[PDB]
Structure formats: C-alpha cells, structure tokens
Amino acid sequence: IGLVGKKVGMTRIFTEDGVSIPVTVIEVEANRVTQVKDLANDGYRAIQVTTGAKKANRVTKPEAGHFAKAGVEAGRGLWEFRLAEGEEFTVGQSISVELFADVKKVDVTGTSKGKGFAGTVKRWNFRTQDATHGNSLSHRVPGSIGQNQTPGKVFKGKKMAGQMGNERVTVQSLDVVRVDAERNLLLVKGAVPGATGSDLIVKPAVK
Amino acid sequence: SNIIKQLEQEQMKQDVPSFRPGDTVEVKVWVVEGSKKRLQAFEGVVIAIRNRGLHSAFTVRKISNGEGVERVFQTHSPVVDSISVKRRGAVRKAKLYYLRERTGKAARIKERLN
Amino acid sequence: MRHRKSGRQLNRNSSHRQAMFRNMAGSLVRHEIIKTTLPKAKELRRVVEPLITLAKTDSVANRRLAFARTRDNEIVAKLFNELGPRFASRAGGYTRILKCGFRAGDNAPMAYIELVDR
Amino acid sequence: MIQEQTMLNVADNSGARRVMCIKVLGGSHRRYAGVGDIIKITIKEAIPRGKVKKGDVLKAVVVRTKKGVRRPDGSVIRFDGNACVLLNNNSEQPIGTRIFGPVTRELRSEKFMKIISLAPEVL
Amino acid sequence: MIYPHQYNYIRSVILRLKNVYKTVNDKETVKVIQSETYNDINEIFGHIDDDIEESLKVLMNIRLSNKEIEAILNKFLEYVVPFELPSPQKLQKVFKKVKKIKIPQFEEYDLKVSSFVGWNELASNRKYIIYYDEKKQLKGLYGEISNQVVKGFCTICNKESNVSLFMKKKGDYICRDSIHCNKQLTDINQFYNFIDKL
RNA sequence: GGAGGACCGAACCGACUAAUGUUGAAAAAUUAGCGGAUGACUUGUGGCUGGGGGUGAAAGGCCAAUCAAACCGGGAGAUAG
RNA sequence: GUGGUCAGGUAGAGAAUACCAAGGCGCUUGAGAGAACUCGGGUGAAGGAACUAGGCAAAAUGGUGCCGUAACUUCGGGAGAA
RNA sequence: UCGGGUAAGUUCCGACCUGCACGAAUGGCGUAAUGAUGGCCAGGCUGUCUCCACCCGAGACUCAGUGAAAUUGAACUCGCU
RNA sequence: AAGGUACUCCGGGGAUAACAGGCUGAUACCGCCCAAGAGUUCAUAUCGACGGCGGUGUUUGGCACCUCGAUGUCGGCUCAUCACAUCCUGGGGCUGAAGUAGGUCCCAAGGGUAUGGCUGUUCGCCAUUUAAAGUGGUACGCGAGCUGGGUUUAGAACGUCGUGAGACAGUUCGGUCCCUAUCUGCCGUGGGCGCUGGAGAACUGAGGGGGGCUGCUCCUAGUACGAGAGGACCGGAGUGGACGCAUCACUGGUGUUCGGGUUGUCAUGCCAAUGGCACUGCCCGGUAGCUAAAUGCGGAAGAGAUAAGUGCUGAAAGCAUCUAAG
RNA sequence: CGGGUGUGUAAGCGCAGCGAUGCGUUGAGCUAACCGGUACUAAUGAACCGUGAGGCUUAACC
Ligand SMILES: [K+]
Ligand SMILES: [K+]
Ligand SMILES: [K+]
Ligand SMILES: [K+]
Ligand SMILES: [K+]
Ligand SMILES: [K+]
Ligand SMILES: [K+]
Ligand SMILES: [K+]
Ligand SMILES: [K+]
Ligand SMILES: [K+]
Ligand SMILES: [K+]
Ligand SMILES: [K+]
Ligand SMILES: [K+]
Ligand SMILES: [K+]
Ligand SMILES: [K+]
Ligand SMILES: [K+]
Ligand SMILES: [K+]
Ligand SMILES: [K+]
Ligand SMILES: [K+]
Ligand SMILES: [K+]
Ligand SMILES: [K+]
Ligand SMILES: [K+]
Ligand SMILES: [Mg+2]
Ligand SMILES: [Mg+2]
Ligand SMILES: [Mg+2]
Ligand SMILES: [Mg+2]
Ligand SMILES: [Mg+2]
Ligand SMILES: [Mg+2]
Ligand SMILES: [Mg+2]
Ligand SMILES: [Mg+2]
Ligand SMILES: [Mg+2]
Ligand SMILES: [Mg+2]
Ligand SMILES: [Mg+2]
Ligand SMILES: [Mg+2]
Ligand SMILES: [Mg+2]
Ligand SMILES: [Mg+2]
Ligand SMILES: [Mg+2]
Ligand SMILES: [Mg+2]
Ligand SMILES: [Mg+2]
Ligand SMILES: [Mg+2]
Ligand SMILES: [Mg+2]
Ligand SMILES: [Mg+2]
Ligand SMILES: [Mg+2]
Ligand SMILES: [Mg+2]
Ligand SMILES: [Mg+2]
Ligand SMILES: [Mg+2]
Ligand SMILES: [Mg+2]
Ligand SMILES: [Mg+2]
Ligand SMILES: [Mg+2]
Ligand SMILES: [Mg+2]
Ligand SMILES: [Mg+2]
Ligand SMILES: [Mg+2]
Ligand SMILES: [Mg+2]
Ligand SMILES: [Mg+2]
Ligand SMILES: [Mg+2]
Ligand SMILES: [Mg+2]
Ligand SMILES: [Mg+2]
Ligand SMILES: [Mg+2]
Ligand SMILES: [Mg+2]
Ligand SMILES: [Mg+2]
Ligand SMILES: [Mg+2]
Ligand SMILES: [Mg+2]
Ligand SMILES: [Mg+2]
Ligand SMILES: [Mg+2]
Ligand SMILES: [Mg+2]
Ligand SMILES: [Mg+2]
Ligand SMILES: [Mg+2]
Ligand SMILES: [Mg+2]
Ligand SMILES: [Mg+2]
Ligand SMILES: [Mg+2]
Ligand SMILES: [Mg+2]
Ligand SMILES: [Mg+2]
Ligand SMILES: [Mg+2]
Ligand SMILES: [Mg+2]
Ligand SMILES: [Mg+2]
Ligand SMILES: [Mg+2]
Ligand SMILES: [Mg+2]
Ligand SMILES: [Mg+2]
Ligand SMILES: [Mg+2]
Ligand SMILES: [Mg+2]
Ligand SMILES: [Mg+2]
Ligand SMILES: [Mg+2]
Ligand SMILES: [Mg+2]
Ligand SMILES: [Mg+2]
Ligand SMILES: [Mg+2]
Ligand SMILES: [Mg+2]
Ligand SMILES: [Mg+2]
Ligand SMILES: [Mg+2]
Ligand SMILES: [Mg+2]
Ligand SMILES: [Mg+2]
Ligand SMILES: [Mg+2]
Ligand SMILES: [Mg+2]
Ligand SMILES: [Mg+2]
Ligand SMILES: [Mg+2]
Ligand SMILES: [Mg+2]
Ligand SMILES: [Mg+2]
Ligand SMILES: [Mg+2]
Ligand SMILES: [Zn+2]
C-alpha cells in the first residue's frame, strides 16, 4: 500500500563522496484508516485513509459521521489504496512513514502546476513559424490542422491550444534517499509533481 | 520552510571563512584518481558570491596555462576541503563580471587595507 | 501565468502607476478619507501604510525618504507631525476600506479608504 | 555546447589555429558536443609548415568549453573559450605531440589518456 | 580509380589466380603466376593503398577463398568509376531521328562495370548503344537486333556467348545482354574497334 | 580667392525596404529606416493649351478618386443569331 | 493635405535632438483582469547566417581632434578608404 | 570543360571557343567616378536560425454604455463505407 | 479586303481546353507462369532468353462526365493522417549460409526513419552523419494557417522571328497574396436537466486516450568457428542519442515592482539631498515567479492468444505425412 | 514585527585635501512577489435557496 503526504519543498543531500542529490521533502504524517472495503460488501479489497487535520466548523455532518464510525479524528481529505491479498488492516489503525523504510523506489502522484490556457508551442512543443521573412501574423500559430476535402474534417485528438497542468501526474521509480519516522519525513531523489504544500500520494514502485 | 531549514542546517559547514568579492582565495578541492584521493588547489579572485544557506556558492576566476578559468564552488559541499583568503581586494561591486573582459594591468584589483 | 506575483498593472505603465499613487497617497494624508475604485484602494494601502510606518521615527533621513516617495513637504510635515504620533501605538492597519457601490459613468466598483483614527 | 558551424581554438601543436565543427558525431539529430565529445572539423586556419593544412577534414575532441562542465556536487568549471584537440580520423588519436592549456577530468579515459598526460593541468 | 574494363581485367586475373591455385600442382609455376597476377594488379594501379596491399596479400596466400575473392573484388570495385548515363535531352540529341527514345533503369553496379550502355526496344527489335568516345563525347548507335538467339563468339567481347545478329549486308553477332557483354569486355579498344568495324 | 546639376545634413521636395493596416485612422496611409536638399531645385497667386484634341526627360503616363480616346446631354428604346 | 509671418532658456554646429519658458493641451467611452494568440518594444546561456529565394528583419557602426590610409584614376578623385 | 573560392558551389570569378542564335552609332570593346541598380564573397554584428525563454506596454477576456458589416431557399445543419 | 493586342473590352459556354476529381488502364509500376540458358558441375542459392497471365491506380496518356454568375496553380514552412509493395529495429525458411558479413523469399506497420553546399526547385549531385535517412495515398494533404523564390498582367532589355504592330513550352531585371467563424469538425471550459426523498464524500470500471525508438562499450570469450585472417549465437551489465513527462534543489536566462552607477535638462528658494523627463534615458547587478541550456523520471519486464515458421503423436493412404482427431 | 535575500559602506556630521575627492561613523542605508510570526485593517448578525420521511407491482423474509 501507499501513504498520503504533503510536498514540503525541495533541497539537496550532500554525500560523503561529494555527490549532491536533489531531494523532494515529503511530510508523511500518520495516515488513519477510516474504512476497510471488502469483496463481500464492496466487491474489492481496499483501505480508505485520512491524514492531517480539518477545522471542526469546516467538517460537515455527513463527513463527521464517517470519521466517527471509524473513531478517527477528521482529516483534510479521504484517499483509498487497493489492498494486496496478503495485506490486512483494521479501521482506526494508523500507518506511518516507517512503511517505506525498506522500499528502494517509489511512485509519487500529485496534481501538476496549473499553467492555464496554453498555446500549441508550450503545450505540445509545436515549432514556431519564421520570426521574419514575410510571416504575416502567424509566428506562434499552429499551422495546418488537417488535409482537404478528404477527409474534410479535423481528426479527434488533434494537438491544439487548451488547458495545461492542474492534472494528476505520476513520476515512477524515484529513489528513496531517507526515511525519517521521527520527523515524519520521506526524502526522495528528484522532482515530483505539484507546488509546495500540495497533497502527494506515495506508493512502492509498481515496476 | 522550518522542516527544510532544519535539514539544510544539519548539513551546513561551520568552518566557512569570511570572504568578499575581489578577495584572492585558495580553494583546496578533493580529487580522486583511481583509489588515491588528493587535494588540488585552485587560487583566483572571488568574482561572485551567492548567499543561499546550504545552497551558497562562490565563483573563482584564474588564468591557467594562458587560459581563463572560472570555477563555481558549492560552499557547503564536502568536495571543498578548505577555503583561505590569500589577499583581500577593494572593489565597489558584488559581482565582478567586468574582470572577464580585462587582462593584465586592466584586471588588477587594489588591496583592501584596514 | 502570474504565480506568486504581487501588484496590479491597472492598465497603466509603471511610471503612471507610481505617479498616481504618489498623488493619491498625498490626497489620503491631506483629507484622511477619499473615494476611489475598490482595486486602487487595495493598492493604495501598500503605498500609504509604509509612509506612516516611516513617519513613526522622525529623522532628517526619514523625512527625506518620505519626500522622495511623496514629493510634498506639506504631506511629509503632516505625516511626521500628526499621523506618525497618532498611529504610534498601532502596528499596521493604518487605513480601512469601505465598499460604497458603483460609479454612475462606468459602473466601476467604488470604495472609501480612510485613516482608522479619523 | 558545440554545434555545427561553431569555431574552436586548437589546444595542441598540430598546426591548426582555428577549426570549425561540421558534424557532432554519435547520434541522429544530435545537437551539441560537450567536453569529451568527438566532432568532425575542417581546418579554417593553420600555421605554415604545420602537420595539418587548411581545408583538411578530420576529427577532434572538445577539451574546453565556455558553457563548461558540471561536477556531481553541482560545481561548474567554465573556460573563456572553446578548444579541441585534433585527432586522426581512423585512429582517433592526437595528431599533435603537445597539449596546451588546462583540460577537465572528463577526458580521463583510455581513449583520451594520452591527452591527459600531455596536458599541463587537469581540473 | 580504374575504368570498368580495367576492373573486369583485374577480375579475370584474380579468377585465373584462383583457378591456378586449384589446378596447378607445381609450386614454382604458382609462384610465377602469383608474381604475374601481382604485377598485373600493380600495373593497373600506379600507387597501391594499404588496403590494396592487404588484398594483394590475401591474393598471394595459396589458400585463397571465394568469399575472400569477393571481398577483394568489392575493395577493387570502389576504385572503379561508374559509366554516366546521359541526360534525357542529351540522349535525344544523340538520337534525334529516334522519337520518344527511352533507356531502361540500370543498376549502379551495372553502370560501374559497363563500358557502354546498350538497351533493346524489343518491340521494334532495336538495340541502342551509347558510349563516350576518346574525346569523351557520348556516341550512340542504334541497329536492328535478331529475335532468334544462338550461341556464338560475340564481336564486342570476342567471347563465345548467346548472340543475336546486329545491323546498324555484313553483320556482327553481339551478346543479347549488353550487361553480360560489358562484364566480358576487358578492353575499351576492342569495343572501339567493333565500332570502327561497323 | 570662393567655383560646383560639389560633399554631409534639418526645413522643403520625393518615395527604395520592411512591418502594420486591407468592412483601414486613410478609396494609397502610418511607423522605423531611405533619396535629393543652390538646382535640369522647390513653392504661392494668376494665366494659356480641349478630346483623335491637349500635354508627356516617353510610363500609353496624365487631362478633377474617370483614360489604347474625359465628362455631360442628345441620336437612343443603337444593336445583342 | 493646406501658402506666409514670429523664433525665449540650458546643452548643441544647428530651425537636429533632449529637457524646459511664454503659451497651450491629456487627443469625448470607461472600469477590471493579467490566458492563448496578434501588434509594438526590452533582455537573453552556448553557438553565430547553420536561417532564407535572398542576412528579409534585427543587431551593429555612428562625434570631434590627431595619426594613418591600397588597387586604380579622366589626376579632380578613390577617401570619412582601411 | 578546366581552374579559383567551399567540407561540399546548377550561383559567382578567371579561362577555353563548340558564337543553337555576339559584332561595330536600332554602335563594338574598354572605362575613373557615380547608383535606395543585378549577381557573388569576407570581417563585424546579431533571436534570422539551433530553440525558444522571460519581461514591459496596446488589443484579445470580464463588467457598464453605445452599437455595425459581408452573407442568408428553408433547416430539427454528426462519423464512416 | 491582311495582321497585332500581355494596354485591352463586352455578351456567352463547363455545349469546349489548362488545375484537381471521375471513367479507362495503352503506358507505368508491382507480381506471377513456362524454362532457353548463366551459375566449374548443377534451370530454379542467385539470375532468367523467347513467349504467356495478372494486380495496383501509381506515371505519361485517352475521354470531356462535374466545376467557366471563379474548385487559387509549383516549391518551401507549419501541422499532419492513412496504406504496406518494410528503410531500421522484431520473428523465420533457403543459401553458391565455416565465423564475421551478406544474398533471396516469407511474417511483421509498435515505434523510429539526418544536417548541410548548389539550385525556386520537387529532384539530383556532392560533403558529412545515422540503427535507418522507406515507398506511396490524403484536391501531386495542408495559401478563409504562413511564404511568394518558380510560374502567367501591365515596365525594360538581349538572342531570335517578323516590313511592322508585336511575339517566343528562350533568357534577363522589377513587380498589391483580403475575410471580425454562422454551421460541421476539433481543442479546452461551463450552464441545464436527468439518474425517482434530499444531501456530503469515497469508489467500481463499461469504454476511450497516452506510451511502445535505438546506438555504443564491457563481460560471457579471443570462446564456438576458421589454415590463418578474423570472430560470434545465446545470456548479462553499464553508459549514451533522439523523444516524452515532471520540477526549479543546483547551473543559468528573464526579472520596466529591489539596490546602485552615470549623461543632458527641469523642478523642489538656494547648498546639500532628492524627484520628473529623455527606449526602463543609458548602464551594472539581482529577489520571488516563470523557465532550459538545468536535473529527476519513463519506453519495460511479465502474461495470454497468435504470424511466418518449427514440431510431437497420427490415420485417411499396411509406408510416409506438423493435421484430418489430439 | 523579526529574518532572509539583493544591492554595496545612505543621509547627516566629523576629519584630510586648494579642490575634484578620500576616510571615519559603516558592510552602512535601502530592500518586490520569499520565510517565520502577529488580529492592526478587512473578511457581519442576518437574509436566500433547499422541506416536513419519499410511487406502483411482485417475490422473499420477519
Ligand atoms: K474622344
Ligand atoms: K538607327
Ligand atoms: K563609344
Ligand atoms: K555594381
Ligand atoms: K483585327
Ligand atoms: K501475382
Ligand atoms: K544446383
Ligand atoms: K472554370
Ligand atoms: K535471412
Ligand atoms: K511499423
Ligand atoms: K505522407
Ligand atoms: K487542387
Ligand atoms: K503553396
Ligand atoms: K477554403
Ligand atoms: K490568416
Ligand atoms: K453545416
Ligand atoms: K532555477
Ligand atoms: K531566477
Ligand atoms: K536628474
Ligand atoms: K563612507
Ligand atoms: K555616510
Ligand atoms: K546589507
Ligand atoms: Mg496556474
Ligand atoms: Mg522554422
Ligand atoms: Mg499584409
Ligand atoms: Mg509579426
Ligand atoms: Mg501573493
Ligand atoms: Mg482598458
Ligand atoms: Mg520614463
Ligand atoms: Mg548637390
Ligand atoms: Mg513623381
Ligand atoms: Mg518616412
Ligand atoms: Mg548624393
Ligand atoms: Mg544631402
Ligand atoms: Mg485621375
Ligand atoms: Mg473610339
Ligand atoms: Mg435611331
Ligand atoms: Mg437596349
Ligand atoms: Mg507643403
Ligand atoms: Mg531652442
Ligand atoms: Mg524638435
Ligand atoms: Mg500581456
Ligand atoms: Mg512580442
Ligand atoms: Mg535587443
Ligand atoms: Mg544570445
Ligand atoms: Mg553571450
Ligand atoms: Mg563572430
Ligand atoms: Mg545557407
Ligand atoms: Mg536550409
Ligand atoms: Mg536589413
Ligand atoms: Mg537597429
Ligand atoms: Mg555561403
Ligand atoms: Mg568548378
Ligand atoms: Mg549563396
Ligand atoms: Mg566565368
Ligand atoms: Mg548600325
Ligand atoms: Mg550603348
Ligand atoms: Mg561591353
Ligand atoms: Mg459590452
Ligand atoms: Mg462524410
Ligand atoms: Mg511588356
Ligand atoms: Mg505598354
Ligand atoms: Mg467576360
Ligand atoms: Mg462537360
Ligand atoms: Mg483531367
Ligand atoms: Mg469536381
Ligand atoms: Mg521475357
Ligand atoms: Mg487520369
Ligand atoms: Mg460526347
Ligand atoms: Mg457559385
Ligand atoms: Mg507484408
Ligand atoms: Mg501506426
Ligand atoms: Mg502491444
Ligand atoms: Mg539536400
Ligand atoms: Mg497540393
Ligand atoms: Mg504527400
Ligand atoms: Mg492570407
Ligand atoms: Mg485551404
Ligand atoms: Mg515570384
Ligand atoms: Mg545587338
Ligand atoms: Mg489501451
Ligand atoms: Mg495505442
Ligand atoms: Mg531532455
Ligand atoms: Mg528557489
Ligand atoms: Mg542570474
Ligand atoms: Mg535585467
Ligand atoms: Mg530654482
Ligand atoms: Mg546640487
Ligand atoms: Mg516635467
Ligand atoms: Mg517635455
Ligand atoms: Mg512482451
Ligand atoms: Mg504412421
Ligand atoms: Mg524586513
Ligand atoms: Mg546581504
Ligand atoms: Mg544614494
Ligand atoms: Mg570599514
Ligand atoms: Mg508568511
Ligand atoms: Zn559481347
């Protein structure tokens, strides 16, 4: 299974050999199991977990009842992780960063930074047309978007300008530089999706 | 912030000497050839200093074998064994990029006497 | 994108913006309350309040810094002689903005901005 | 960061003074050559009675670059000019008998071990 | 660099040397042939590159192999200069009387080994031969070629081959396949003499 | 001493390039550059030349946003396989 | 687009240009926002015409004094050569 | 075609003469100077380009006021074969 | 009773040409049949005379069916998408396959598949790369996306033809590329209603999309193979090119909102100190953010069912036979 | 408010010099979008929308 964490930011770790490792600091506070899904009731085996804290006024009555049944305190959100056949958890159990103590590589999922509406040059690495040499008002424009009477349309999935970022992204096979249970910190090599303070789902690498 | 600051502070060197732009400094750097590890010295004017905690860096410019060489060092990196200010220089600017276009008598820096 | 950026362009160049706020800051010091567009009032706080903070300590250098920012000796005098002493105890929040409907000519959102003591 | 059309100084005594990169070898659409990268060059300028002559097409290894090289700690070493050592096309061994100016540790390989030995300073 | 006919000569001598190795039972005779063959190749190239020398060394080895021969032939082939096919408009200038004349596409190797280019219309039973003269001006001849095919000594190559009578009324039998003919031809002069004979 | 279809360069007179503009700010311009700038120079006012006619350092150019034959009215409801 | 007249100060060769005087104006829709893209600009690592039909456009050069300045020439020039 | 220039030159320059179809006032061949003239090369210079990035402004976008146009048989106006 | 018109004009025609489409397929291109021969020998490793039979729509054409009350035409740029007759990478049979490296045929469309010099070029040649630099269709894809060098107005000239006006499937220099998107389509992003009491969350996964490239080095091993020369299969490891995603710790760029230097001028009474204006006046540095040239990560392994192909057992058909049952 | 970062030793005053200027006070002054804090200012008591136990048939169970 995996844990939910927050992106504290980025830094470096200097090795004695003198290699500097780019690391992303992920704060993995204890994740409290709010619900356990089973094949009999839900048709799939999974655990729902919460992390962090939520303002009591901000928590709604329907949300509060779900937390109350678990016996856990309200967390900022609810996330599910699918269970392997061997794995077994109980409602109210807390899972810490020590889970990843023996995990060499992890996959980190987060919402990418939102770029808003983006042109084809930025979004799809389209080439710009000539800056000079007579180009009329068509420096960063997409160019042709189709053929002619055949097929007489634009095909679906045509790369065009539109929203860029603010989407779920996974970076796979990131090395685990350090696991710190005392500080509730997971240090992973390299950049991970999202801005500082964003929610990060960390799992053991599938590959 | 505070979390990263704690992590950054734990790795930071406490022996880093005071140096300013325009100072002539010698940086001893660890160099490994095969099994053997030795200290190589790089001596030149400090032309730029970036103050950024653990991410602090400084740039040293020398003329070596008739070729101008600039080396950006990570201050708190273990590779840098030691830093020593050979001479203190009197300049008015933080960054000495103008020294890149100057050679010989033009590139001379006055000593700061205090 | 404008991630983590501060300040409003207000459909002007930088020189016009600076000049307008220098005039508007003077107006607020002189009258202690002025009617302006809501976005401009929010920007004016970031210019006027530091001037009052500067006025708290009276020195030739501070007065000259205030003169550089305001370019009005009357405003500088009132700041150091009156506003500085008046707001000495208060830490920030030297002004308040009150929304006051829409302008007839252009339907612009309008607000009053005043010194809190007034 | 050397590309086709880039002019390089010569860091050896082959007799070439100025050379131009005509190809970055080693890949399809490979844009750039850094220190330690072999390039195809034409001799734009040469000394009289040199080993090499103007208009000759041969290989070279980049030894110094303005862009510089990055070390594992994150340190950077940059040079004031881009320089190369002329190599025989087939042998890919230095034509010159001497190396002038400092060279990087990136050239510390069996292929370019001769250059390191000849070089005055290795940084 | 060598002419196609020159390459063909080299090819022939190499084949002879291989045949000699197989057939000749006397070492001394073989030595003479080895020298003869070596000299001939040395005659072909005023200056021999190390690759040629290496090839010669392989040739010198008594235990020559057909694969080795082929490789050696390939190395020698590189030196050969290909025959240049004329431009469509040039060709038309060569054969003004002929209308809408066309040349079938020739393999680059074929061009390399071809002293002259000859193609048959077949429909009109016409063979067109184009060759650059000593002045290096292209020269074209077109003549009737017999549909019937018989084995006989071909005038162009002076070798027994499948030949069809050619009339540009004395006639000279020539190889039906010009490409085969070109391979057989080892001397440009022989072809020139054939043209003179016409 | 002070020549020049002399030189550099504003006004002034042009109009080589590019961009913009093309239901324009504009039925030919704007912006950045560009050429001439005491001369076969440029400009005000008034005048003269009239349509197979004028005028043209000549492009069929120009002759009131019109030109291998102006515009207006008439023959005239030309004629139109 | 439209002929004539008047011509302050500092700097400047100047009626260029910059900032100002007298004098006159802010150009008869505004207010926000701070996407793509278009227009008009600023800056740019390393490379430097590889762009392109073409260095188109851009960048660059730019003053005064002095030194110095080629082929060629109709003896003037070329020449502000460089 | 040969030579020069380039790593590579259908352009360029110098030759050759095989002038499809030069040639002597509808001038021949030269020619200093001059040219917003055609071609070619070099140094400098650069976002022209490798390959785009960021930034400042004017639009675009949203709100209030005013308020066009070309076009239009009628429309309940999808893909594929 | 002869000509010119590119200085041109009007009425008409898709009744009739040039472009593209269509029909056709001579031609073209691709494949097959026979096998004279070549191949030392030996038709069929490879190749294939004389002849024969197809396929494609793919060149040059034929026709004149659509369009002449307008369907913009070469090349480039930008952006593509499909086919497979496959250029590379994958699998396999035969070989005149010792190895290495090839030839040829079969299967295979997942991904990938140069930059320059010259020329308007497409192309081609050349230089230097690459695993390779595929061939075609898409109005010879793509001008309501760009370009305008080619080409086909008006100016001018040369050669040439003409008495001449003029003209050239000759050349030369110059020479206006419009459109604010209604609909379909496409990329994004909302509103409505529904889903049967209302509401807040977490999901399942029908279905859809993305991605899928590859070099070199080392080890196995100078091992198998070979007279040597040379030199593997299989398997494993490392490090790259190109491409993609994310990010800003580092290295940098930018940073007219930060600090400083500095020219001219004007003002703040003046001095001193400041401010305005001159591209941010000109510059030098530079925070955050954004960002690439910066630095992390990815393509997979594995599984299932198969292609060509290889078999096991096995009759029909006492043998043989991978197939008919299995 | 504190810090950090950047720029690079403010102004004023004193001293030295004929003066331009230097030096001391002084790594000074100033410092955007950063970091850690802090209710000083502004996020209002309300109001509004959305209801009042959720069809029929059949089967099973209680
Ligand atoms: K008339
Ligand atoms: K005459
Ligand atoms: K004459
Ligand atoms: K000229
Ligand atoms: K006529
Ligand atoms: K077939
Ligand atoms: K056989
Ligand atoms: K038509
Ligand atoms: K094979
Ligand atoms: K494929
Ligand atoms: K295609
Ligand atoms: K078409
Ligand atoms: K086109
Ligand atoms: K269209
Ligand atoms: K357009
Ligand atoms: K429609
Ligand atoms: K960064
Ligand atoms: K930055
Ligand atoms: K000033
Ligand atoms: K001081
Ligand atoms: K001071
Ligand atoms: K400081
Ligand atoms: Mg965003
Ligand atoms: Mg481009
Ligand atoms: Mg235009
Ligand atoms: Mg543009
Ligand atoms: Mg903010
Ligand atoms: Mg506005
Ligand atoms: Mg300004
Ligand atoms: Mg004059
Ligand atoms: Mg005129
Ligand atoms: Mg102008
Ligand atoms: Mg002149
Ligand atoms: Mg002049
Ligand atoms: Mg007119
Ligand atoms: Mg008439
Ligand atoms: Mg009548
Ligand atoms: Mg009538
Ligand atoms: Mg006038
Ligand atoms: Mg004046
Ligand atoms: Mg003026
Ligand atoms: Mg903008
Ligand atoms: Mg722009
Ligand atoms: Mg610039
Ligand atoms: Mg640059
Ligand atoms: Mg640079
Ligand atoms: Mg340069
Ligand atoms: Mg080019
Ligand atoms: Mg090109
Ligand atoms: Mg230009
Ligand atoms: Mg410029
Ligand atoms: Mg060139
Ligand atoms: Mg030549
Ligand atoms: Mg050229
Ligand atoms: Mg010539
Ligand atoms: Mg005459
Ligand atoms: Mg004449
Ligand atoms: Mg002449
Ligand atoms: Mg409106
Ligand atoms: Mg359709
Ligand atoms: Mg004409
Ligand atoms: Mg005419
Ligand atoms: Mg007509
Ligand atoms: Mg018809
Ligand atoms: Mg047709
Ligand atoms: Mg049609
Ligand atoms: Mg046949
Ligand atoms: Mg057809
Ligand atoms: Mg008919
Ligand atoms: Mg129509
Ligand atoms: Mg196939
Ligand atoms: Mg595909
Ligand atoms: Mg698959
Ligand atoms: Mg090419
Ligand atoms: Mg087309
Ligand atoms: Mg195509
Ligand atoms: Mg257009
Ligand atoms: Mg179109
Ligand atoms: Mg054209
Ligand atoms: Mg003549
Ligand atoms: Mg799928
Ligand atoms: Mg797929
Ligand atoms: Mg990359
Ligand atoms: Mg940062
Ligand atoms: Mg920087
Ligand atoms: Mg800057
Ligand atoms: Mg005054
Ligand atoms: Mg003063
Ligand atoms: Mg003023
Ligand atoms: Mg002014
Ligand atoms: Mg698999
Ligand atoms: Mg059996
Ligand atoms: Mg502070
Ligand atoms: Mg500091
Ligand atoms: Mg100051
Ligand atoms: Mg001090
Ligand atoms: Mg904070
Ligand atoms: Zn023959």
Automatic annotation (TrEMBL), chain E:
Residues 97-185 form the Elongation factor G-binding protein C-terminal treble-clef zinc-finger domain. The keyword Transport does not apply. CDD domains: FusC_FusB. It comes from the Bacteria. Residues 1-84 form the Elongation factor G-binding protein N-terminal domain. InterPro entries: EF-G-binding_C, EF-G-binding_N, EF-G_N_sf. GO terms for molecular function: metal ion binding. The keyword Oxidoreductase does not apply. It holds the Pfam family EF-G-binding_N. NCBIfam families: fusB. This is Far1.
